[PDB]
Amino acid sequence: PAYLTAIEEIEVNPTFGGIYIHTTNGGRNYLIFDVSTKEHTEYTSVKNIGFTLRGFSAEPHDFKVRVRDLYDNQSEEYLTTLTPLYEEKLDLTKFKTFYLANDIKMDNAGHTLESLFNGDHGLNSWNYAHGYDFNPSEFPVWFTFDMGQTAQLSRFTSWQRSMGGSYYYRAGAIKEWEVWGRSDLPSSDGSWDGWTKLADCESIKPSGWPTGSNSEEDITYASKGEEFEFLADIPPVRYIRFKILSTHDGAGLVVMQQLWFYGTPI
């Protein structure tokens, strides 16, 4: 019966501010998960069941899970005591360029990719990592770096190159991208085999004004850092890629100022 396989194969792991519950359901049956603390009901029929409860402090808490079906069957309780994950800013000094053969180069104009992790950021900053021009027909493009440790990621903050603000939302500022990762050594050829997608991301321009016109709200917003959250169902990772799909001005050029990552080191 699906509800029995569900309770028998269940895994419950800590995640940021709660727990991640996963189980199997190869029949695509309709299961109801009731999750108790001393708080949520999931209604799902996917094959690879995975869902989160959040809102919890990072200390040990007792959790109870029961699975039921639309036929009035109900499982034994699964009990677990788990501590939710709590994020820290990962140590920037361990972040390094990890250049693979099919990556864009980010060492133009006197800087390197590792400039994105040197701490220098904000409206008046001249810091950046700066690529080379390419034809936008070549999007998507990507670059690769090493976090220098393995971590369960929560979120990251991204700053565009600024130089007083007029460079926001043009001149290499990225618009949509994906963040991919892996925990084991990449292949030197830059093959995408062995990489896992971790986040879909879109940098928002609050005003929605065309290229070359930035509002006061746009400039304040970008200078404060753009925040993105990662998927809960991701493995620990060490190596990271940004697969750039688009840029704000549509030109084939990537230029950014800073990237700070948050999560729990392994």
Numbering used by the authors: 128 to 165, 174 to 401
Sentences from the paper on this structure:
Herein we have identified eight Sus-like systems in B. thetaiotaomicron that share the feature of a homologous SusE-like factor encoded immediately downstream from the transporter/lipoprotein duo susC/D. Two SusE-like proteins from these systems, BT2857 and BT3158, were characterized by X-ray crystallography and BT2857 was further analyzed by small-angle X-ray scattering. The SusE-like proteins were found to be composed of a conserved three domain architecture: a partially disordered N-terminal domain that is predicted to be proximal to the membrane and structurally homologous to an FN3-like bundle, a middle β-sandwich domain, and a C-terminal domain homologous to family 32 carbohydrate-binding modules, that bind to galactose. However, functional analyses with BT2857 and BT3158 revealed that the SusE-like proteins exhibited galactosidase activity with para-nitrophenyl-β-D-galactopyranoside and α-(1,4)-lactose substrates, that has not been demonstrated for SusE proteins. Using a series of domain truncations of BT2857, the predominant β-D-galactosidase activity is suggested to be localized to the C-terminal DUF5126 domain that would be most distal from the outer membrane.
BT3158 crystallized in a C21 space group, with one molecule in the asymmetric unit. Diffraction data for BT3158 were processed to a maximum resolution of 1.50 Å. Despite performing diffraction analyses on multiple crystals and no detectable protein degradation observed via SDS-PAGE, discontinuous electron density was characteristic across the majority of the N-terminal DUF4959 domain. Iterative rebuilding and refinement of this region suggested that it is composed mainly of β-strands, consistent with sequence-based homology modeling as an FN3-like bundle domain. This deficiency in electron density across the N-terminal region and sufficient size of the asymmetric unit to accommodate the domains was similar to results seen in the prototypical SusE and Ea domain of BT3700; thereby suggesting this region is consistently disordered and likely forms a discrete domain that would reside close to the membrane and have flexibility independent of the rest of the protein. Beyond the membrane-proximal DUF4959 partially disordered domain, BT3158 presented a distinct two-domain structure, with backbone residues confidently modeled with the exception of an extended loop (166–173). Structures of the DUF5000 or Ec domains (BT2857C and BT3158E223–P440) were compared via the MatchMaker in Chimera using the Smith-Waterman algorithm, yielding a RMSD of 1.225 Å across C-alpha atoms, and a quality score of 0.768. In BT3158 an ethylene glycol and H265 are also structurally conserved. However, this is where the similarities at this region stop in that in BT3158 A304 is in a structurally equivalent position to D304, and none of the other residues between these proteins are conserved in this region suggesting sequence and structural divergence that could also reflect functional variance.
